Design a protein around this nucleic acid. Structure first.
Ligand SMILES: Cn1c(Cn2ccc(C(F)(F)F)c(Oc3cc(Cl)cc(C#N)c3)c2=O)n[nH]c1=O
Lengths: 407, 536
DNA sequence: TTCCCCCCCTTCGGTGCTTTGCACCGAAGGGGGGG
C-alpha cells in the first residue's frame, strides 16, 4: 500500500529524550524480540529521520509497552489519514450509555508497510552514560501510533467487525489510533460478557487482541454566582468583575444597577446593604446563567483547543473550545489518589480523561494548553502516561489570573 | 580488508562541487604516493570535472576544503548523543585503552560517491578511495562501521565492557590482569581481521589513563590541571577564556561562582576592548583560584548504593549540587546560575535546579537521586498548594543549614478589617510617552505624580509604589491592571526591573497586604475618581 | 582553503498576548573539552 508525505515538508527529525535505566533495558529486550520476527530492522547513518521512543506500563500490568512519538509524522501525512480514508464519527456515540476501550495494536503487526515509507519511521534506543551510540531501528510492518495505520487497516477491521456488527447492531463501534470504543445499551452485568464475546470473536479471526466508561455522564457544567445576604463591598466588586468577564460569553449579561450601587470610595470590608433592585438584577442574571450558552457549533475544519486551570486542593478545570470565548464544553476533574502520590500525576490523568472524552464526543484529540513548565513536564510525563495516544500540547507562561470558573 | 559499503548521496537538485583548477607536483606526491601504495587515493580521469579546493600544510597535511561538498552532502543523522562521563564508570579491576589509528583511512567509501571527493594537482587527478578527513559523513559512517565490527565480540564476551567514542576503545574487565592482557589480545586480533590497525603495545595504557581533561586513576578520577591565566590587564577574550575554564573545572571542584565574572562581559563592543574589573569580580576570581589551588578528586559509580544530590544556595541566584553515593565522597559537582524569567523567587529557582539535576542524572547514571533540599516541607506545601502551576520535586529530605530558602511575604486572602483601602491608577499617553500615577484612599486623600518616559504598566506599578509608601503596616490596594496584579501575585524575590525590586522591598516590611482587581473604565466606586484624576 | 558532538553565558528575533509594551522561548555569537 503506497504511502506518501505532504509535498513540501521534511520528514520527522525529532531528538530522543533521555530515559531511565529500567525503561532503556526494557526497550532493548522488547526491540530484540521485535527484530527477530521481522517487525523492525536496524538501519545505518544514511537515514536522517528519527522519532522519540519510550516505555510505559499500561494498567500496572508489570509488563512494558513501547510508545513511539509520532506527533510529527501524523502532522506530515495528515493527507493519508483525512483525505484517503478517515472513518466518520458516529453521531450517536455522544448520547450512548456505556463504552469500553480495547486495544487492537497487535493486529496491526501483520500488514507490511510501504517499501519507500519505512525510512521515515526510524527511532533510537539510547544508552546509559553514552557508552555506545544509540541503537537505531526502523519499522517494517505497520506501526502502532501512526495515523496512517488506521487508514490502511480500516478495510480489514471493517471486514473483521461485519459479522459481529450485523449480529449485534445495537453496539456502536469507533476506532481511534489502534484503540476501539465499543458502546452498549445493555446492562452492566451482561455488557462485560458481551465485550468478552467480542474479544473472543476478534481472536477467532486469527488476530490476537488484549474500562466501563459512561459517556452520558458528561454535561457542560454551569458557571455559578455567589449568594449570601450580607454583601460586602469587596464581594460586590468581585461579583461585578465576574459579571463583566461573563458578559463576553453571555451576550445578555448586564451589570448596571450594581455599578450605581458602588459610587463612594468605601472600604472593601464594611457591609453595604443591597437593595431590592440589585436583588432583581441578580435573580435575572442567575436566570440567564440557568440556560446554556447559545451559538456554539462544531466545525470539523477548525481545531480543538483544551485549556486547563488548577484550582488547588486537587481540583482541575478544563474547557474545550474552537472559537475563543465560546466553550464547546466545560468540566471539572478531582481525584485524591494523585495528591497522595504526586502533582504532575493529577495533570496527567486529567489530560488522559479530557482526551478520551473529546475522542468519544467529537472524535479527535484536542490541542492542550498545560499549566506546567516545559522541563518538569517533559521529565515526568512518561512515568504516569498509560494511553497509547499522545495529544499535541503547548505550555502557558502567563498566569491565568481570571480563575473565575471556581471563585 | 573487507568492510561493507554504506549508500551515500547528495541533496536533490544539484551535482558535486567544481572549483577552479589550481596550478608540490613531485615532492608532495611522494607523500600521496604512499597513500596510493596502500589504496587510499585512486586515479580519476578527465571525465569527472568535479573539483575541490586543494590545500597543503606543513605538519609540526592535506586539509582539503570540503565546504561546498560538506554543504551539498545529504543529511547524516548524528547518532553521538553525548559524551561519556567518568562519574558513570563502574569500578573495573583491569582497564586498557586502545587508540585505533588510521581510522578514517581504512573505511571504504561508496563507489558512486567516490568521484565527488576529487583533488586537483597537475595529468593525474586524485580521488579519496577511503573515508575523507573532515567530510560530513565520515564520523557517523566510521562509528557505525566500528559498532558493526565490535558487536559480535561483545556478544561473545559479556563480562568485557567496551566504551567506544569516535576512534577510541576503552576496555574494562573484572578478570585478572594476566587474563585481561589475553582478552585484549583476542580483541586486537578480531579488530585486525577487519583491517583496523589497532596498536599492540605502542599506545596501550596503564593507570593513570588520560582522556578529555580527565585523569583516570585506579580508584578515582580528576580533571587535568586547569591553569587559570594570571594578568593585570584583562580584555574581554581573557574574561571569556576564564569563564569557560571555570565552568569546565566546576565539574569536580565544589563552590565555584562565575556570575560576577560574566557580568563584566555585558555591554562590550568588540573582542579586543579592555574592561576593568570591579571589586566583586576581582574577589570572586580570587576566591575561585584559591579554591582551585588544592587538588580534588571524584569517585566512580557503585550500583549497589543510592545517589544523594544535596543542594545549597550561594546567594542571589546561585545554587550548587554535590551528587554523591557515600558521604563526603563526591561523584559529581555542579552549579546552577541560570536565571530564566524576569520575575521569579527562590523556590522556583530551587525546583528548576532540581529538574536540571534530575535530567542530568538520568542522562549519566540512569536513576534519579534522592534530593536533600534546603527547604522546609511546610514551605514547599504552602508554595505548591496555593500556586497556579503544576510543580513537583521527585523525592527529598530537608537540610538544616543556612542560608535557607523560604517564602518572603504572604499576600492576604480576604479583606482585612479596620485597615485602609487605596484605589490606585496610572495613565500614560501613547505618543508623548509621558504619564501620571496616583491614588485615592477611603479618607478622600488623593495624591498624584507626573512621570516621564513611563508607559501604562510602568505608571501602574508606580501607583502601587505610592500606595505602599503612604500607607501603614496593613493596606488593601485595589487596581484595574492585570499585569500589575500578576507581577505582584507570583511573590517574586528579585526582578530585572528595579521598580518591582523596590515594590518587593516595601512588601517585605508591610505586615499584611491584600490586592483586589476591579475592571477598568466601568464605574466601580473609587475607580471613577482615580481615573478622573489621571484624566486631567 | 578543520569537520562535527556536548556544556555554559549573551544578544537577537519571533510571538503571543499583557497589546504595541512586556514577558517568554529558541537560535546565533563567544568560551571550555578534545575527538
Ligand atoms: C581507571 N580505572 C577504571 C575506570 N574505567 C572503568 C571502565 C572503562 C571502560 F573500559 F568501560 F571504558 C574505562 O575506560 C575509559 C573510559 C572512558 Cl569514558 C575514558 C577513559 C580514559 N582515559 C577510559 C575506565 O577508565 N576502573 N578501574 C580502573 O583502574
Amino acid at each position: 500500500v503506497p504511502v506518501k508525505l505532504k509535498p513540501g515538508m521534511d520528514g520527522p527529525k525529532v531528538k530522543q529524550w533521555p530515559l531511565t535505566e529500567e525503561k532503556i533495558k526494557a526497550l532493548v529486550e522488547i526491540c530484540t524480540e521485535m527484530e527477530k520476527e521481522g517487525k523492525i530492522s536496524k538501519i545505518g547513518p544514511e537515514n536522517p529521520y528519527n522519532t522519540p521512543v519510550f516505555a510505559i506500563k499500561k494498567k500496572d500490568s508489570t509488563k512494558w509497552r513501547k510508545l513511539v512519538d509520532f506527533r510529527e509524522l501524523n502532522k506530515r501525512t495528515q493527507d493519508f489519514w483525512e483525505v484517503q480514508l478517515g472513518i466518520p464519527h458516529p453521531a450517536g456515540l455522544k448520547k450512548k450509555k456505556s463504552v469500553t476501550v480495547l486495544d487492537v495494536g497487535d493486529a496491526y503487526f501483520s500488514v507490511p508497510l510501504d517499501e519507500d515509507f519505512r525510512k521515515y519511521t526510524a527511532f533510537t534506543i539510547p544508552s546509559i552514560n553514552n557508552e555506545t551510540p544509540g541503537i537505531r531501528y526502523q519499522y517494517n510492518v505497520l506501526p502502532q501510533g501512526w495515523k496512517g495505520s488506521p487508514a490502511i487497516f480500516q478495510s480489514s477491521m471493517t471486514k473483521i467487525l461485519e459479522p459481529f456488527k450485523k449480529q449485534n447492531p445495537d453496539i456502536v463501534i469507533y476506532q481511534y489510533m489502534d484503540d476501539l470504543y465499543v458502546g452498549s445499551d445493555l446492562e452492566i452485568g451482561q455488557h462485560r460478557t458481551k465485550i468478552e464475546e467480542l474479544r473472543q470473536h476478534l481472536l477467532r479471526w486469527g488476530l490476537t487482541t488484549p474500562y466501563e466508561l459512561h459517556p452520558d455522564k458528561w454535561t457542560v457544567q454551569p458557571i455559578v454566582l455567589p449568594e449570601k445576604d450580607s454583601w460586602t463591598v469587596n464581594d460586590i466588586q468581585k461579583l461585578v468583575g465576574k459579571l463583566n468577564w461573563a458578559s463576553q460569553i453571555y451576550p445578555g449579561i448586564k451589570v448596571r444597577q450594581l455599578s450605581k450601587l458602588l459610587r463612594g470610595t468605601k472600604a472593601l470590608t464594611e457591609v453595604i446593604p443591597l437593595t431590592e433592585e440589585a436583588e432583581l438584577e441578580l435573580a435575572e442574571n442567575r436566570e440567564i446563567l440557568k440556560e446554556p450558552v447559545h451559538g456554539v457549533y462544531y466545525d470539523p475544519s477548525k481545531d480543538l483547543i483544551a485549556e486547563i486551570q488548577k484550582q488547588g486542593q486537587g481540583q482541575w478545570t478544563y474547557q474545550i473550545y474552537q472559537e475563543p470565548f465560546k466553550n464547546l464544553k466545560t468540566g471539572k476533574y478531582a481525584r485524591m489518589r494523585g495528591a497522595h502520590t504526586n502533582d504532575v500525576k493529577q495533570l496527567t490523568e486529567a489530560v488522559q480523561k479530557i482526551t478520551t472524552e473529546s475522542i468519544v464526543i467529537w472524535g479527535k484529540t484536542p490541542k492542550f494548553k498545560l499549566p506546567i513548565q516545559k522541563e518538569t513536564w517533559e521529565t515526568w510525563w512518561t512515568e504516569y502516561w498509560q494511553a497509547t495516544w499522545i495529544p499535541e500540547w503547548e505550555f502557558v507562561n502567563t498566569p491565568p489570573l481570571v480563575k473565575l470558573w471556581y471563585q | 580488508s573487507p568492510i561493507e559499503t554504506v549508500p551515500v548521496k547528495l541533496k536533490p537538485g544539484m551535482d558535486g562541487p567544481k572549483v577552479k583548477q589550481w596550478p608540490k607536483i613531485k615532492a608532495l606526491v611522494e607523500i600521496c604516493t604512499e597513500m596510493e601504495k596502500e589504496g587510499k587515493i585512486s586515479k580519476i580521469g578527465p571525465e569527472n570535472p568535479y573539483n575541490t579546493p586543494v590545500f597543503a600544510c606543513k605538519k609540526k597535511r592535506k586539509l582539503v576544503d570540503f565546504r561546498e561538498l560538506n554543504k551539498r552532502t545529504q543529511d547524516f543523522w548524528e547518532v553521538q548523543l553525548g559524551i561519556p562521563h567518568p562519574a558513570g564508570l563502574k569500578k573495573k579491576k583491569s582497564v586498557t585503552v586502545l587508540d585505533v589509528g588510521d581510522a578514517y583511512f581504512s573505511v571504504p567509501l561508496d563507489e558512486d560517491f567516490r568521484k565527488y571527493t576529487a583533488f586537483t594537482i597537475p595529468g593525474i587527478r586524485y580521488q579519496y578511495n577511503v573515508l575523507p578527513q573532515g567530510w560530513k559523513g565520515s564520523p557517523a559512517i566510521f562509528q557505525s562501521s566500528m559498532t558493526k565490527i565490535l558487536e559480535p565480540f561483545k556478544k561473545q564476551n559479556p563480562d568485557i565492557v567496551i566504551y567506544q567514542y569516535m576512534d577510541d576503545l576503552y576496555v574494562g574487565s573484572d578478570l585478572e590482569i594476566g587474563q585481561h592482557r589475553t582478552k585484549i589480545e583476542e580483541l586486537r586480533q578480531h579488530l585486525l581481521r577487519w583491517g583496523l590497525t589497532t596498536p599492540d603495545k605502542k599506545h596501550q595504557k596503564e593507570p593513570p589513563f588520560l582522556w578529555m581533561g580527565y585523569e583516570l586513576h585506579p580508584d578515582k578520577w580528576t580533571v587535568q590541571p586547569i591553569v587559570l591565566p594570571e594578568k593585570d590587564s584583562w580584555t574581554v577574550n581573557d574574561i571569556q577564556k576564564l569563564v569557560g575554564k571555570l565552568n569546565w573545572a566546576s565539574q569536580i571542584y565544589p563552590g565555584i561562582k562565575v556570575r560576577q565574572l560574566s557580568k563584566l562581559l555585558r555591554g562590550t563592543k568588540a573582542l579586543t576592548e579592555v574592561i576593568p574589573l570591579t571589586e566583586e569580580a576581582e574577589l570572586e576570581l580570587a576566591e575561585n583560584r584559591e579554591i582551585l589551588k588544592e587538588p580534588v578528586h571524584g569517585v566512580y559509580y557503585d550500583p549497589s548504593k543510592d545517589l544523594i544530590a544535596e543542594i545549597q544556595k550561594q546567594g542571589q541566584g546561585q545554587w550548587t549540587y554535590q551528587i554523591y553515593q557515600e558521604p563526603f565522597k563526591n561523584l559529581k559537582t555542579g552549579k546552577y546560575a541560570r536565571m530564566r524569567g524576569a520575575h521569579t523567587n527562590d523556590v522556583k529557582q530551587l525546583t528548576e535546579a532540581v529538574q536540571k539535576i534530575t535530567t542530568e542524572s538520568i542522562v549519566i547514571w540512569g536513576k534519579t537521586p534522592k534530593f536533600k533540599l534546603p527547604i522546609q516541607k511546610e514551605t514547599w506545601e504552602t508554595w505548591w498548594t496555593e500556586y497556579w502551576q503544576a510543580t513537583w520535586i521527585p523525592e527529598w529530605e530537608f537540610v538544616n543549614t543556612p542560608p535557607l530558602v523560604k517564602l518572603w511575604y504572604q499576600l492576604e486572602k480576604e479583606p482585612i478589617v479596620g485597615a485602609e483601602t487605596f484605589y490606585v491608577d496610572g495613565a500614560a499617553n501613547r505618543e508623548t510617552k509621558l504619564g501620571k500615577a496616583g491614588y485615592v484612599t477611603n479618607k478622600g486623600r488623593q495624591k498624584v505624580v507626573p512621570l516621564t518616559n513611563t508607559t501604562n504598566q510602568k505608571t501602574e506599578l508606580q501607583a502601587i509604589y505610592l500606595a505602599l509608601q503612604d500607607s501603614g503596616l496593613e493596606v488593601n490596594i485595589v487596581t484595574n491592571s492585570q499585569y500589575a496584579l500578576g507581577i505582584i501575585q507570583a511573590q517574586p524575590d528579585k526582578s530585572e526591573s528595579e521598580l518591582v525590586n523596590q515594590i518587593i522591598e516595601q512588601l517585605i516590611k508591610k505586615e499584611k497586604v491584600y490586592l483586589a482587581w476591579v475592571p477598568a473604565h466601568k464605574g466601580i466606586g473609587g475607580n471613577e475618581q482615580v481615573d478622573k484624576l489621571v484624566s486631567a
